Amino acid sequence: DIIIATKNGKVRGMNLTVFGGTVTAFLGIPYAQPPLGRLRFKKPQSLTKWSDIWNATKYANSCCQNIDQSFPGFHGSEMWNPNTDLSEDCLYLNVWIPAPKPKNATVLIWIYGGGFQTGTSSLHVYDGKFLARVERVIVVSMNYRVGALGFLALPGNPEAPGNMGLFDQQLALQWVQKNIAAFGGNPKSVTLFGESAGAASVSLHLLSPGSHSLFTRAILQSGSFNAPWAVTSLYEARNRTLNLAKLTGCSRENETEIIKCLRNKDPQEILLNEAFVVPYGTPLSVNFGPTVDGDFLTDMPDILLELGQFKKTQILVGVNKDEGTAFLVYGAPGFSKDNNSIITRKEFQEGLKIFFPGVSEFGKESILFHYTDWVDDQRPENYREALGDVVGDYNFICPALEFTKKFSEWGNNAFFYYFEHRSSKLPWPEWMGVMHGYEIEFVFGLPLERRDNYTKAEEILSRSIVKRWANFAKYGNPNETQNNSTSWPVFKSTEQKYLTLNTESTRIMTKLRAQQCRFWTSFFPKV
Ligand SMILES: *C1O[C@H](CO[C@@H]2O[C@@H](C)[C@@H](O)[C@@H](O)[C@@H]2O)[C@@H](O[C@@H]2O[C@H](CO)[C@@H](O)[C@H](O)[C@H]2NC(C)=O)[C@H](O)[C@H]1NC(C)=O
Ligand SMILES: *[C@@H]1O[C@H](CO[C@@H]2O[C@@H](C)[C@@H](O)[C@@H](O)[C@@H]2O)[C@@H](O[C@@H]2O[C@H](CO)[C@@H](O)[C@H](O)[C@H]2NC(C)=O)[C@H](O)[C@H]1NC(C)=O
Ligand SMILES: *[C@@H]1O[C@H](CO[C@H]2O[C@@H](C)[C@@H](O)[C@@H](O)[C@@H]2O)[C@@H](O[C@@H]2O[C@H](CO)[C@@H](O)[C@H](O)[C@H]2NC(C)=O)[C@H](O)[C@H]1NC(C)=O
Ligand SMILES: COCCN(C[C@@H]1CCCN(Cc2ccccc2)C1)S(=O)(=O)c1ccc2ccccc2c1
Ligand SMILES: *[C@@H]1O[C@H](CO)[C@@H](O[C@@H]2O[C@H](CO)[C@@H](O)[C@H](O)[C@H]2NC(C)=O)[C@H](O)[C@H]1NC(C)=O
Ligand SMILES: *[C@@H]1O[C@H](CO)[C@@H](O[C@@H]2O[C@H](CO)[C@@H](O)[C@H](O)[C@H]2NC(C)=O)[C@H](O)[C@H]1NC(C)=O
Ligand SMILES: *[C@@H]1O[C@H](CO)[C@@H](O[C@H]2O[C@H](CO)[C@@H](O)[C@H](O)[C@H]2NC(C)=O)[C@H](O)[C@H]1NC(C)=O
Ligand SMILES: *[C@H]1O[C@H](CO)[C@@H](O)[C@H](O)[C@H]1NC(C)=O
Ligand SMILES: [Cl-]
Ligand SMILES: [Cl-]
């Protein structure tokens, strides 16, 4: 039998045959009390015990969330939709262990993204058996509440204080600290890693004092808290809570009555109203996400980062070459995943209004000016490409770079990557390039599965990324080998060196997109 004793009871695993070896998987370990009934909107409560041997042999329920149904049958979007029953009873986690069982393995904890409204640990691109098999690390991933059920905020009120999903993550980090040694793992070697909102989440755990001792090191893939979508101000969050009460028939004299009313609502009644809590939106809208709750976050995160009030440790940060394109076919006029999406200069300008609703006309004018200095005047795909880069630079690349600069300025080693390979199996059209989220499958080592129809070059690339991530986790240094390996230099605010990741060559380069990002940090805010 495959049985591990944990502080909350014994749990039964299952064997996976991986690359002619065995990985032991414990899928769907509860780590918190089910946030049902009176526990809805509260911080997660510690788990006491489950009754008998818990069978962690199938993934757990995913947290409640609206589904992306924009493209029925399309793998490109359905690969992100939850693949287990949705339920409010979702606070579970997964643990993959190398066989034979390690004595003190480094632990990698995955935090999925999904704009704080979606995601689940059970997606196939987050399958952790490959990393455990190939690098002999332990992999943990957890489900955390998303949407209003996860980030409804009445700051100061324990009935709905804000940042519950972040606290879900945190409680799972505490569970690893309490229990991972029984799975053979080193609680003193724990690396958080995640993508998009998960990366924004990792970046917020660097700032949260309660998480300081729950992990060693941090990997931020295509995301950071200073991205414009990631953190809502204290009273912007409160306002949206009130509007949800309004929209559901739960407006009440005092706040606890409002929360009382919202606990009576069906989950679908909450989920289907989440989109209407803001006056206007964008394809990158986070209606209920992290906020300044005074508990998980004691000040605006921008300030804590400025003042060095964060966990002093090593980080690995990076972005993808076409972060913006994904969001274009979700509300930008003239953009379809089924044509080559050539757009006019007028369609570009309409896209700016879609993605920048509350920005002045001269604000849009200067965005347009900064992104039209064409190398070749036509080149009929200039505006199509300009709009992607605007969305990608403003929402992801430039914030990730600025976070890395300011963080490295306080003395810890920081490593930046620019991932430029488009997957041979990427189901979206070619014009969308190296999309948001499509480095993940390489990080988790799926190209290592030869029966899966990736190219040999993608196996080598994924094998190299898998080595660097695991080496970063074990050693604070994302090295590959000492010899025959391009060195990954530290990111330093003067030189700002980064490593490119693709199949042709991995080069050290400097000041990624500095001319574009300089616009977004030092001019656009003044507008
Ligand atoms: C806080 O937010 C409200 C927005 O409230 C609205 O009502 C909700 C039910 C929801 O459906 C939203 O889409 C609505 O926008 C701000 O009030 C606005 O002013 C009036 C008051 O109802 C409303 O008709 C307007 O549409 C809102 N403004 C815009 C630009 O749409 C309110 O000002 C915000 N700030 C504070 C401090 O409360
Ligand atoms: C977890 O599953 C066990 C049974 O699953 C199997 O039995 C194990 C001994 C092992 O051989 C596994 O590989 C099998 O998949 C549940 O066990 C109870 O006890 C016996 C076990 O065979 C069974 O006849 C009983 O009917 C089970 N009890 C009940 C009330 O039906 C065990 O209950 C499962 N754990 C939980 C928390 O449900
Ligand atoms: C040592 O291995 C190289 C490949 O190693 C490349 O990996 C990158 C991450 C980076 O660190 C880089 O400096 C490093 O060189 C081998 O070259 C590969 O060789 C095959 C042929 O066997 C070519 O088809 C590949 O294109 C080539 N990859 C490259 C150049 O990136 C090579 O076998 C070996 N070189 C020596 C001198 O021993
Ligand atoms: C179901 O509820 C709708 C809300 N969003 C739907 C999104 C819209 C855009 C993309 N996809 C994911 C996707 C598709 C294809 C390739 C890669 C990635 C579906 S969301 O909750 O998922 C969302 C919101 C705001 C984000 C802000 C920053 C980054 C990601 C965000 C995701
Ligand atoms: C689950 O995987 C473990 C690890 O591979 C298996 O345990 C091994 O089985 C072989 C075959 O007899 C032994 O030589 C090893 O000594 C075993 N290891 C341990 C730690 O006991 C186990 O058999 C698998 N469970 C299954 C297949 O149900
Ligand atoms: C990558 O670099 C790190 C150093 O940054 C190497 O780490 C040492 O690793 C060995 C394991 O072989 C440990 O026993 C030492 O204690 C480590 N020392 C230090 C100072 O880190 C690591 O070996 C390198 N790996 C490769 C493949 O190059
Ligand atoms: C696993 O590795 C840790 C270190 O990462 C070992 O911890 C001990 O040694 C550490 C020095 O690096 C310190 O944290 C402590 O001196 C000590 N830990 C204590 C006393 O709690 C740990 O022993 C290793 N576990 C193994 C090998 O099973
Ligand atoms: C493709 O996308 C939509 C079709 O649904 C359309 O509005 C747009 O103009 C089309 N662009 C083409 C065909 O170039
Ligand atoms: Cl995502
Ligand atoms: Cl093209």
Numbering used by the authors: 3 to 529
Paper lines:
Cholinergic neurotransmission in the brain is terminated by the hydrolysis of ACh, which is catalyzed by two cholinesterases (ChEs): acetylcholinesterase (AChE) and butyrylcholinesterase (BChE). The assumed co-regulatory function of BChE in termination of cholinergic neurotransmission in the healthy brain changes in brains of patients with progressive AD. In specific brain regions of these patients enzymatic activity of BChE is increased.
The replacement of 2,3-dihidro-1H-inden ring with benzyl groups yielded type III inhibitors, among which compound 2 was the most potent inhibitor of the series, with an IC50 of 4.9 nM against huBChE. The most potent of these, compound 2, shows selective reversible nanomolar huBChE inhibition with a new binding mode, as revealed by the crystal structure of its complex with huBChE. The crystallographic structures of huBChE in complex with compounds 2 [-(CH2)2-OMe], 7 (-H), and 8 (-Me) were solved. Specifically, the positively charged nitrogen of their piperidine moiety engages in cation-π interaction with the Tyr332 side chain, while the attached benzyl ring fits into a groove contributed by Tyr82, Tyr332, Trp430, and Tyr440 side chains, in the choline-binding pocket. The naphthalene moiety is T-stacked (i.e., π-π interaction) to Trp231 in the acyl-binding pocket, while one of the sulfonamide oxygens forms a H-bond to the hydroxyl oxygen of Thr120. The -(CH2)2-OMe (compound 2) or methyl (compound 8) side chains point out of the gorge. The inhibition constants of 1.29 nM and 2.01 nM were determined for the enantiomers (−)-2 and (+)-2, respectively.
